Design a protein around this ligand. Structure first.
Ligand SMILES: CCCCCCCCCCCCCCCCCC(=O)OC[C@H](COP(=O)([O-])OCC(O)COP(=O)([O-])OC[C@@H](COC(=O)CCCCCCCCCCCCCCCCC)OC(=O)CCCCCCCCCCCCCCCCC)OC(=O)CCCCCCCCCCCCCCCCC
Ligand SMILES: CCCCCCCCCCCCCCCC(=O)OC[C@H](COP(=O)([O-])OCC[N+](C)(C)C)OC(=O)CCCCCCCCCCCCCCC
Ligand SMILES: CCCCCCCCCCCCCCCC(=O)OC[C@H](COP(=O)(O)OCCN)OC(=O)CCCCCCCCCCCCCCC
Ligand code: HEM
Ligand SMILES: COc1c(O)c(C)c(C/C=C(\C)CC/C=C(\C)CC/C=C(/C)CC/C=C(\C)CC/C=C(\C)CCC=C(C)C)c(O)c1OC
Lengths: 55, 431, 352, 125
């Protein structure tokens, strides 16, 4: 089988982000979740860099 | 190995062979299913069936003659086989059925009995012959709204609405002299046949030409005939191939030989020198597959067909197969090419030189109708041996690399991914 | 060790080693099948893999077919490479390894698939039943392996010892120069094979008549009749088969198939009626038995049966040829019957 | 809410000429405003299926209706994703909007309710 499916780490990525079967009709309202993950990342990255200068 | 062909009033083509035991004679017209319409689709197949009707067939059986017909896309043929001595009696039956009985075969009792038979015939095909059914639909979607899209056997709806008049209309527009070639194979001489033909005069609809149309074109697309009740998944996938009389006619056929055909149950098949087999045998991605390079007058199809019971891994089957095809543009090896040459010769030989004259007639007829001559088997081998890795790469980089594809399938094809996923695999990422 | 041949100006040659080792002369059930499936596996000097890899580069393939009487090891290839294929075939006949793992991993599976394909076709289930009742133990031996009786690796080896001998095989190369062929055959391991005996008995097989068998089957129903023919009375049945399978006979559209299996010591005539529902199978065969009982012919298909028996170019070594232009009448004595499918709605030997 | 309960209330209204003439016209207008018919769906195609009752019911549905439900559902998703409605001539007509799955659902609920009753039956001596 393809490496993305056989490798222990990549298969997680494959099942969640690559081959994950999505209902054909989901609309833009289903885009909020990824936007929330992005928000979490922006908050963490910017906070760590600021923490470097915070007392 | 003699290709003799002369023209008097009609074009006569023959290929004599000493030891043969039998001789086959027949007329091959330069028009087939590709000349029909979506509405009279199946008229040619219908003609073939009355030509082989119990009535017309019994008349030939008394005389000791055997009948055979073949409906293709670019052509159509009616053949009569006989002993080397009765080479003249085949011509009597040929003329008697295409001039004398070209009104007796079309009786209201014969037509209805035949129509009822081709209906159960075409229905049985659609109900059970899945691999050919899929291959037929492949042509249908690949060449949609174009001549090559029409199926050879015709569709059930166009067939049941067909009448005696439609047969006549087609016959009077295509069964012409300028759109025909009389072929003779077996053991009989060229001079032996041409004399019996030039003996009986009468032109019958001479100077008349068949109607014209629009050029065939490939359209990247797909048709999915999902059916979860079938025990397998049958798929066919292809790119625009090469038309007959194309410089790459052989390069394409060689390319298909590299991947060849496979049968998981035949021990010897599992041992072939095909790299793709290392990938597909681990989890047994399929029961069988076979590559092909179909060539027609205006275009062709290059790809493969496959059957599988591994319904949850169809994506790996398609993925590994397309990755191998990617290799043709970038890394095919000398030895892969050389293996293909040897195997292409063996298969091309087994086709062109079988112990059956009826096959020879179809091969000869189809060729002379398109290029006005036949390339000798020895001439082919010279072209085949001349192919280099550089040739295959140049061909693949034009026909396979990042090119649209056509897909068709039936059975449990839920696992066959969307078009774009398959299409993306027609290439590779690079710096 | 009959070495036949026949040259020609063509580019494809085809070597073939016919061997009298079909199911007819089989010690245990299906052993001939297993041996046929064992051909082209590993030899003591060349592995199955290498054989294929080498032959592919040259431009030729191998194949091993099984008959009720023969076991043919054919090899199609490009003309000039003749010697290679002669020695390849020699190698197989003289020294195939017969490793225990080859049995379990390649032979048994391939054989199981063979039996599976045939187990699903009702006409073949019938054709087998026909042979088993006519010739109760000669040609009536099971063609394929199904495991009813044990067959060890040794049994396959012992059988290969009996069957693979110079006095029981015949080399036959189509499109080959007889000069070089005979030379290479004697210059190979063929001549080193321990020439045993030939089991081709001339005495007519003790066939039975008025025998019937019924087998319940899910799918298409098929009623068939089988008739044991004589060594000289086979030419008429040949025309009969081609008559029933032609536009001349009115009842041609009432049957699925009809043929005559020609052997070395007789033959067998078969007639098959196959259809979805039992009603159409009953009527169609009941009509045939009635029309054939009040038999007729008049030899209208005398040239047709001679034409169809000529298109078989691989059989240019056939028995009688001019026996056709003799008898022109046919009746229908006692025969054998087999009902396969919807048994409870199928005719018996009585009502025929 | 079980379909047995919806049927109880619904039938009581349908039998009484007082309510039947008052409610039905309202219900009919509600159904048209819903709009599922413009997508080619029948109400029963809309029932949430991720529960044992609905799985039992869908399992018992005859082949022809099953293949039909499948086509309607697939056709609805495709139309929804294209942000269109089907051509009016393809809409489901009121005569076609029949409760085809309802009888199977009611039967399964009754069977289920009986098992629950029997598994908890008390005994008096
Ligand atoms: C003081 C407070 C200030 C307010 C702050 C605002 C909040 C910001 C935080 C979050 C903002 C980013 C999130 C974006 C998505 C949010 C909206 C959403 O998901 O609506 C989906 C919803 C679903 O649409 P759909 O059915 O899937 O789309 C079919 C498309 O035709 C399918 O068509 P398509 O795929 O081929 O293309 C679709 C479309 C896709 O366009 C997009 O990028 C996403 C759709 C967003 C449309 C407008 C969002 C307005 C957000 C404010 O692309 C277009 O061509 C449309 C462009 C229209 C205008 C976009 C705005 C331009 C702003 C200039 C700067 O779209 C709407 O109906 C929009 C409703 C707008 C009201 C939102 C109310 C909350 C406020
Ligand atoms: C968080 C904010 C991140 C913003 C960064 C945006 C990413 C930039 C998008 C540019 C896309 C570049 C590109 O072409 O990516 C291609 C890969 C290929 O993916 P593929 O499935 O292998 O290819 C199919 C399509 N081809 C490549 C044949 C054309 O496709 C991909 O892998 C694209 C996935 C990118 C996911 C991020
Ligand atoms: C940091 C990465 C460290 C990898 C170890 C390197 C090594 O040594 O990796 C060795 C393995 C060999 O594994 P093999 O599958 O070839 O098996 C051996 C033969 N059957 O290669 C890999 O895993 C390559 C995978 C690379 C991708 C790493 C990160 C994937 C990103 C998403 C993470 C998802 C997990 C989320 C978990 C919460
Ligand atoms: C989802 C996660 C987070 C959320 C919602 C969040 C939210 C906030 C908010 C509301 C403030 C005040 C903003 C203002 O100045 O008005 C703040 C401040 C701060 N955050 Fe976070 N935060 C998150 C994660 C982090 C993380 C992981 C760090 C890492 C140390 C961090 C470090 C800080 C620091 C240093 C400040 C003070 C600087 C500032 O005022 O912006 N934050 N955060
Ligand atoms: C079936 O439905 C799905 C679905 O399944 C998925 C997966 C997606 C796709 C969306 C996602 C997978 C979102 C996922 C997001 C997350 C898991 C975010 C998790 C959060 C994190 C903060 C990750 C942790 C990060 C860090 C440790 C890095 C920060 C620090 C750094 C770089 C070090 C800095 C310091 C120095 C010195 C350089 C869908 O959109 C979707 O519906 C359409």
């Amino acid at each position: 089988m393809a490496f993305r499916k056989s490798n222990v780490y990549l298969s997680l990525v494959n099942s969640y982000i690559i081959d994950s079967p999505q209902p054909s009709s989901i609309n833009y309202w289903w885009n909020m979740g990824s936007l929330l993950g992005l928000c979490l990342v922006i908050q963490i990255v910017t906070g760590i860099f600021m923490a470097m200068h915070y007392s | 190995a003699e290709v003799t062909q002369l023209s008097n009033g009609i074009v006569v083509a023959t290929e004599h062979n000493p030891s043969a035991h039998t001789a086959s004679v027949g007329v091959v017209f330069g028009s087939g299913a590709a000349n029909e319409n979506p509405y009279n689709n199946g008229v040619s197949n219908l003609w073939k069936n009355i030509f082989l009707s119990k009535e017309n067939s019994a008349v030939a059986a008394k005389e000791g003659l055997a009948l055979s017909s073949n409906i293709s896309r670019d052509f159509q043929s009616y053949i009569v086989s006989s002993l080397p001595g009765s080479t003249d009696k085949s011509l009597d039956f040929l003329n008697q059925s295409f001039i004398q009985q070209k009104a007796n075969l079309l009786s209201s009792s014969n037509f209805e009995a035949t129509k009822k038979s081709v209906l159960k015939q075409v229905q049985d095909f659609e109900d059970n012959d899945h691999p050919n059914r899929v291959l037929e639909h492949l042509h249908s979607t690949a060449f949609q709204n174009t001549p090559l899209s029409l199926p050879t056997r015709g569709t059930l709806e166009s067939l049941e609405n067909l009448v005696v008049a439609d047969l006549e209309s087609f016959a009077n527009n295509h069964f012409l002299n300028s759109n025909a070639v009389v072929v003779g194979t077996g053991n009989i001489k060229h001079e032996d046949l041409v004399n019996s033909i030039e003996s009986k005069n009468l032109s019958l609809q001479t100077g008349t030409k068949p109607v014209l149309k629009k050029k065939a074109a490939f359209l990247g697309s797909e048709v999915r005939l999902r059916d979860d009740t079938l025990p397998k998944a049958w798929i066919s996938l292809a790119v625009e191939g090469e038309p007959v009389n194309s410089p790459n006619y052989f390069v394409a056929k060689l390319a298909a030989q590299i991947f060849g055909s496979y049968n998981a149950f035949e021990p010897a098949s599992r041992l072939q020198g095909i790299k793709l087999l290392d990938n597909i045998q681990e989890y047994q991605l399929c029961d069988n597959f076979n590559h092909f390079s179909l060539s027609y007058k205006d275009s062709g199809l290059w790809g493969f067909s496959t059957a599988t019971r591994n319904v949850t891994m169809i994506d790996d089957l398609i993925h590994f197969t397309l990755k191998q095809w990617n290799r043709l543009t970038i890394s095919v090896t000398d030895t892969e090419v050389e293996r293909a040459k040897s195997l292409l010769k063996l298969q091309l030989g087994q086709l062109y030189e079988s112990g059956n004259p009826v096959n020879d007639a179809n091969l000869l007829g189809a060729e002379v109708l398109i290029k006005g001559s036949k390339l000798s088997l020895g001439e082919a081998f010279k072209k085949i041996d001349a192919i280099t890795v550089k040739d295959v790469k140049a061909w693949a980089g034009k026909r396979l690399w990042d090119q649209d594809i056509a897909i068709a399938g039936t059975g449990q094809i839920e696992g066959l991914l969307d078009y774009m996923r398959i299409r993306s695999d027609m290439s590779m990422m690079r710096w | 060790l009959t070495v036949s041949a026949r040259d020609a100006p063509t580019k494809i040659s085809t070597l073939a080693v016919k061997v009298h080792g079909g199911s007819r002369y089989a010690t245990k059930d299906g052993v001939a099948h297993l041996l046929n499936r064992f051909n082209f596996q590993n030899t003591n000097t060349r592995s199955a893999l290498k054989l294929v890899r080498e032959s592919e580069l040259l431009g030729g393939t191998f194949k091993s077919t099984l008959d009720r009487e023969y076991i043919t090891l054919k090899a199609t290839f490009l003309k000039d490479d003749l010697p290679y294929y002669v020695n390849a075939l020699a190698d197989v006949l003289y020294k195939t390894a017969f490793k225990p793992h080859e049995l379990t991993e390649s032979v048994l599976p391939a054989a199981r698939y063979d039996y599976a394909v045939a187990e699903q076709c009702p006409v073949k289930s019938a054709e087998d039943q026909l042979y088993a009742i006519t010739f109760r133990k000669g040609l009536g031996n099971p063609l394929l392996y199904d495991g009813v009786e044990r067959v060890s690796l040794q049994d396959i080896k012992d059988f290969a010892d009996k069957v693979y001998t110079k006095e029981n095989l015949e080399v036959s190369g189509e499109n080959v120069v007889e000069a070089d062929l005979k030379r290479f055959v004697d210059e190979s391991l063929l001549s080193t094979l321990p020439a045993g005996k030939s089991l081709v008995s001339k005495s007519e097989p003790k066939f039975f008549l008025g025998e019937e068998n019924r087998v319940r089957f899910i799918g298409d129903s098929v009623a068939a009749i089988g008739i044991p023919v004589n060594k000289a009375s086979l030419a008429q049945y040949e025309v009969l088969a081609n008559y029933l399978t032609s536009a001349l006979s009115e009842l041609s559209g009432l049957i699925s198939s009809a043929k005559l299996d020609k052997f070395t010591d007789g033959g067998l005539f078969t007639l098959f009626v196959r259809d979805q529902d039992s009603a159409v199978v009953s009527s169609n065969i009941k009509k045939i038995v009635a029309d054939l009982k009040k038999g007729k012919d008049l030899s209208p298909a005398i040239n047709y049966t001679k034409l169809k028996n000529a298109v078989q170019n691989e059989s240019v070594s056939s028995p009688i040829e001019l026996n056709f232009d003799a008898v022109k009448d046919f009746k229908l004595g006692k025969f054998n019957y087999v009902a396969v499918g919807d048994v409870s709605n199928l005719p018996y030997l009585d009502e025929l | 809410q079980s379909f047995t309960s919806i049927a109880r209330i619904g039938d009581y209204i349908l039998k009484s000429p007082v309510l039947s003439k008052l409610c039905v016209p309202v219900a009919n207008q509600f159904i048209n405003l819903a709009g599922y018919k413009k997508l080619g769906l029948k109400f029963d195609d809309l029932i949430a299926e991720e529960n044992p009752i609905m799985q039992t019911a869908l399992r018992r549905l005859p082949e022809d209706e099953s293949y039909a439900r499948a086509y309607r559902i697939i056709r609805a998703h495709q139309t929804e994703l294209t942000h269109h409605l089907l051509p009016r001539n393809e809409w489901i007509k009121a005569q076609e909007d029949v409760p085809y799955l309802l009888p199977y659902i009611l039967e399964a609920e009754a069977a289920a309710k009986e098992k629950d009753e029997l598994d908890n039956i008390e005994v008096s001596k």
